[PDB]
Each structure stands twice: as C-alpha cells, then as structure tokens.
Amino acid sequence: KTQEEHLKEIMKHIVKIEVKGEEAVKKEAAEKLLEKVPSDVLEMYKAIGGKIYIVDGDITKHISLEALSEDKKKIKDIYGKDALLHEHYVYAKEGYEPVLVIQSSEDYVENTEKALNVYYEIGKILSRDILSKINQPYQKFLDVLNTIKNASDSDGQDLLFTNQLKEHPTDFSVEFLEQNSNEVQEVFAKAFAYYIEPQHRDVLQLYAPEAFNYMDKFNEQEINLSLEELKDQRMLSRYEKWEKIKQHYQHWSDSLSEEGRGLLKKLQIPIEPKKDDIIHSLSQEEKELLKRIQIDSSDFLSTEEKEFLKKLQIDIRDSLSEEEKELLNRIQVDSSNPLSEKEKEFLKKLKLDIQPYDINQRLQDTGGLIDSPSINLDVRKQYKRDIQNIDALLHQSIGSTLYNKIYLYENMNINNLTATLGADLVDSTDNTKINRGIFNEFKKNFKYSISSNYMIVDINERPALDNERLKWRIQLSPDTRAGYLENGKLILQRNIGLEIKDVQIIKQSEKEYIRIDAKVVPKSKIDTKIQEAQLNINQEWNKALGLPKYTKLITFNVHNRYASNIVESAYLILNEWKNNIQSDLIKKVTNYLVDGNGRFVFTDITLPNIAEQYTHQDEIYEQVHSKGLYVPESRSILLHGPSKGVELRNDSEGFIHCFGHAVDDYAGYLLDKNQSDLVTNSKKFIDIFKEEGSNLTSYGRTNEAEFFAEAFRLMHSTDHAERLKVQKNAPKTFQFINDQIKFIINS
Ligand SMILES: CNC(=O)[C@H](Cc1c[nH]c2ccccc12)NC(=O)[C@@H](CC(=O)NO)CC(C)C
Ligand SMILES: [Zn+2]
C-alpha cells in the first residue's frame, strides 16, 4: 500500500474526469488504466504542467484540445495507420502546456488494442515531453536500437521500426539520433507501450528482447534517477533541496568558530610557496650554488616546478654587477647541456620545499597514511594537525527528518583517475564527443571507488570546467558525515566507500560527459573486497609459479577513486608478463625476490609513500615517484596505476620494464655471489652502452641499468616488430641480454 497511496495523491491531482452517467464505474475504469503505468512517469508529467482528461463522446469537443489545429488532427495509431482524431479514443497534446485526452470505456480490460494505444501515447509523452528535457534517450537507448537492427532475426525491426529506420544501412550514430529526434522517440513509445500493456508484453520479449530488457530495467529502477534529474532542472526544486540541507546543518554552521572556518577554507585553496621565504631558508653557501644551476637540465623536476625555481635566481641580483654576466656568459655554451652531481642533490631538496600546502593532495598521495615519512617532519605534523581537526569538524551526518534519499554531485577530471586513459578520452576531431572505445575500456572493471581525502560536492548539479568530462551522481548514506558550505556545497568526511551502480555517456550543454551513478557505503565493505581479491590473486599465481601456498607476493595498496581498476588490471598485467617472458626466467627471478621478501605492489598512492621504498632511503629528498620502480634493497617492483609513464603503451610495458631491473639484479648476484652488484655495472657492458646506448628509446639513453631495462622490455613486447628493433639496432646488447637469460636459467 506504500504505492497505492502515492497514486491517488497524484492521480486525483492531475487526473480529472468529466463524464455523463454514474462517474463511479467510469472513473474506477479509467483508474484501472493508469495504475498500470510506472508511478514516477506520472509525477514527471505533473512536473512539466501536464494533466489528464477523461471524457465522453468526441474528444475534439473538449476545452483543452479545443484550440487544437486542424492539420495535426490526423494521428497514426501504434501500428502507424491514419485515423481521425474525432474518431479516436486518445490524444496527447504536445506544447509547453501538456494535455492528455482519453474517452471513457471499461472494455479496455478486453479491448487490449485501445489500451496498447493509450500507453503508446503515454510513452510518446515520456520520450517526447519528459525525457527530452534532460537530453534523453541517448547513447544507452541508442545501443538498444543498434542491437535490434543488426541482430540476426529481423522481426524485432518490423515490430518497432518504421520503413524510415528499416532502410538506414549503417548503425545509428549519435548525430543521426539528433536530426531524427521524433523517429527515436517513436520507437521508445512503442517499446514502452508493449511493455506496459500486460497482454502485449510477451510479443516484445519474443521479437525484441533487448528492448524488453531495457524498458524492464528502466521502469523498475532507472526511472527514479530520471525523475531526480528532471527535478534537478527546476528552480524551486533545487532551492527547496538546498534549503532543507542548510536548515539541517544550521546548528552546526552557527557554532563554527573562526578557526573552524579557516580550516575549511585552506582545504579549498592550497597555499603556494613564497619566493621570499625560499631564498632566506637557503644558505650563505647554497644561495651561491643556485645563482646559476640550470633547472632546465633536470629530469626529476616537472616544468611546473622548473619555471618557479629559475625565477628564484633572478631575484638574488644585487651587488657587484660584473658577476652577473661573467656567470651568464661563462656557463651557457662551453660548460654545456650535460649535468652535475653535487648540485642535483640541492635541487632534490628544493623540490620538497617548493610544494604547495594542499591538505587534500596529501591525503590522496598517501592514501590517508598521514605518518608516511615522505616529507620533512615539520610539515608532516602540520598536515596531521589540520587533518585531525577537520575530521572532528565534520561530525554530523546528513540523515534528517526533512528528507530521505539525497543525491550530491561532483565534476571530475579523468586524469585524476587514469591519465593513461585520459589522454584519448576526448575525440581528437570533435572535442565535444567522447571516444566510445576509451569509454568502454574506462568502464570495464569500474565496480568500486574509495575516497581517502575530503570530497567536495554540489547539492544540485552544476556545469563542469573544460577538462572535467566526468560527472558523478552520488547517493549518500544517511550515516555519511559532512560539512555545509554557504555556496551550496558539502564537504564529506574522508574514507568513504563507493559502489558504482551505472556508467553511461550523456549529453549536456552541447558536449558529452560520462555520468557515473554511485552509492556511498561503509569503506570497510570495499576494503574487504580488495583483501579477498589479494588473497585470490596470490593463491592463483602461487600455484602458477610453484610458490609455497601461503606466500605473500602480490600486494594491493589501494586507497583512491579508481580503486577497483587497480585490482582488476593487476591480473591483466601479470598475464602479459608471463605470456611474454620465459616461464623459467620468471620463476628463478621471482623465487630470488621472494627469498628477499620482495613484493609486487600495485598501488594508487604515490611511490614515495610505499614502505617498500621509503624504509630503504638514506635521505627523504632521495625519494622517487613514477610509473614503475625497482627497489634492490626490498627486492620489490612498485607500479603506480593512475599515472601515464613517458610513452609506454600500457601498465604492462611498465611492469615488465621494472622486471628488467630485477634481472639486472639476480644476474648481477650470480657473478659476484660474494658481493652485491649489477651485471649492468660490468665493464663488458659499460662499453656496449658507449656504442648502442642511443639505438633505443630516448629514455634508455639515461644510463646503464636504464638501457638494459628498456632493451629488455622491448625484447618482450607484444608487437614482435619491437623485438626485432633491438635485434637490428642493438645487436651487442641483444646478445648480452640473451646470454644473461641463460646464465640464470641454467644456474
Ligand atoms: C611518469 N612516469 C614516468 O615516465 C617517469 C618519469 C621520471 C623519470 N625520472 C624521474 C624522477 C622522478 C620523477 C619522475 C621521473 N619514469 C618512470 O616511471 C620510470 C621509472 C624507472 O626507471 N624505474 O626503474 C620508468 C620509465 C620506463 C617510464
Ligand atoms: Zn628504469
């Protein structure tokens, strides 16, 4: 009866009968007709100012449809056969003041033909009058249309298509759907009708199963999100929602201190480095070294950082002028492009000091592991104080008596999730369309997400920045804690859990975006999934490599918004790895690793924050962050997913490159089993690098190990051509490596 109530409330509100004889049997008859339509499509019609009129005799003879034009007075039935309006039993008047007219009859229980037509007209209202206001149907329903057209049995077409669509060769492109607006809306109406009229439902499932499934899933679940999105379009609706939430947090807001307000503020605007401070905290000796070191010569500083640094030299220019040029004039050419040890150390210490104070970034980088010793102790503690405090400020949950389900919105840049994919998300030709191919890949294994920092969301959806093609629709839990912001936003507590309920391409303001429907759940529920996954992937590969049953080789250090993908991609990476390297080369090397308690860490927090690396660092500034990294001391391969390595097709290439470094380790172990050195450091190799140390990837031209690793990787790619490349361009190395693989396999 939870449903029953909702009906009459709305029905007697939008539905008005006007008959002759006893209006008890006639009303209860027409009511039996509407009760079969999804409760929500009735409320969406109310929203756009629609009303339903049940009358006797000719329908054209009614107040509303009175001002109707003579021309259109010729509508076709569900089967597309003309029939004049003053002779029909239904009609849905379009326009910005929607009206629905139906003749009185109870035989609808028998005459399924009329009922099917009434629902047809209604479906027409849903697609043409309602959903169009929120750019629907779109790609999803479009896919159904194509599944239906190219399918084997062509009956599904004869059932829902018109000869207009029946003749179109190629699939229906997004553009098609745009210029053929009414056509698509038509199919929707017909599918809706057949699915709603109890008697024709089977015919739909028989000839057009995909269409049945779509309307089935739409009418049961997804219909409510449509209502929600339609409401989001309405002024009074948006401000009524914002006000209840504001009211709910009024006490909390009214008690916020100035200190509190200040904390929330810097959470929104990071503090940038003060050029002044920088210099001062240098050193009488150091300042000397910075006056002319070239920041452009570094390979560990982002241009972003470089630009800033060089602007510090320029600000030291004071006394004894002559110096200025003797330095500018004595360092540029005869000194050259190359490098310098002692001073690069200086730049690595400065990198740390010139990072902006960004609380959210810190949580994201560390996955919430705020004690990570990846930055100087002084700032680490400052971050910990502000964080602990923010956790205490956002204590009140969203649950209220003023409302039930509540959706909050977040616009996001895809690079923040997967840079490697964000490179081709947008269509290169037309920047307003989404590359369907990347879409499917991105969507692939995206089942759950994690928030380790403080998410900032909008109460009502708002337009995104140019580089934000991701639009999240999140259903909060009444348990979720948050803070209210005057500008119509909420700051959510850290360590939230998110299940991905749906992912689809949607149009808005002439551009396409990726709508992500998510539901907030306990972070423990997601973590448990990750942990069961780790257990699974280890049993599986322990068996494939012949390792003791309970060894801990593979580890998931997952804490961010693309969580599920890090886990699932790990399986795929390890596969390209075995199917591209000598099964016996793997075993000896990983066995060696396991002996040293090594690990294969797949993570989404920055590498400087993985213990497998930081616990073996002499100095903090010596840390390294990148796509992949091999650590000899811990004997582990670290792979950071979110990133995009310097032109390396995928994560696999990256993982393999690191395994290369591992080989250079074991092989180097076999030579001087009495010492700890790399076979890549051997003289016999130093020379080869002096000759072929340029015949490969620009990167390989960095140094010994790097060269060996890149060569190794190529020699194992999936594109066999790349294997030959080293063959015909780095012969010396090719052999050296293949000798190395034997010198391990056999020993
Ligand atoms: C964004 N990912 C990248 O392309 C960075 C770039 C980089 C080089 N040196 C650095 C020092 C500090 C921070 C970043 C870098 N490099 C890497 O990931 C390389 C890491 C490596 O050589 N591991 O053994 C693997 C290589 C095949 C891409
Ligand atoms: Zn390397």
UniProtKB/Swiss-Prot annotation:
UniProt-annotated catalytic positions: C658 (proton acceptor)
Ranges for region IIB: 358-521
Region feature (I): 1-233
Alphabetic keyword roster: Host cytoplasm, Hydrolase, Metal-binding, Metalloprotease, Plasmid, Protease, Repeat, Secreted, Signal, Toxin, Virulence, Zinc
SUBUNIT field: Interacts (via ATLF domain 1) with the cleaved form of protective antigen (PA-63) anthrax toxin; interaction is required for LF translocation into the host cytoplasm. Interacts with PA-63 homooligomers (either homoheptamers or homooctamers): three molecules of LF bind the PA-63 homoheptamer to form the PA(7)LF(3) complex, in which the relative position of the N-terminal alpha-helices in the three LFs determines which factor is translocated first.
Reaction catalyzed: Preferred amino acids around the cleavage site can be denoted BBBBxHx-|-H, in which B denotes Arg or Lys, H denotes a hydrophobic amino acid, and x is any amino acid. The only known protein substrates are mitogen-activated protein (MAP) kinase kinases
Job of this protein: Lethal factor (LF), which constitutes one of the three proteins composing the anthrax toxin, is able to trigger rapid cell death in macrophages. Acts as a protease that cleaves the N-terminal of most dual specificity mitogen-activated protein kinase kinases (MAPKKs or MAP2Ks) (except for MAP2K5): cleavage invariably occurs within the N-terminal proline-rich region preceding the kinase domain, thus disrupting a sequence involved in directing specific protein-protein interactions necessary for the assembly of signaling complexes.
Top-level taxon of origin: Bacteria
EC number from the UniProt entry: 3.4.24.83
Region IV: start-end pairs: 523-747
Name of the featured protein: Lethal factor
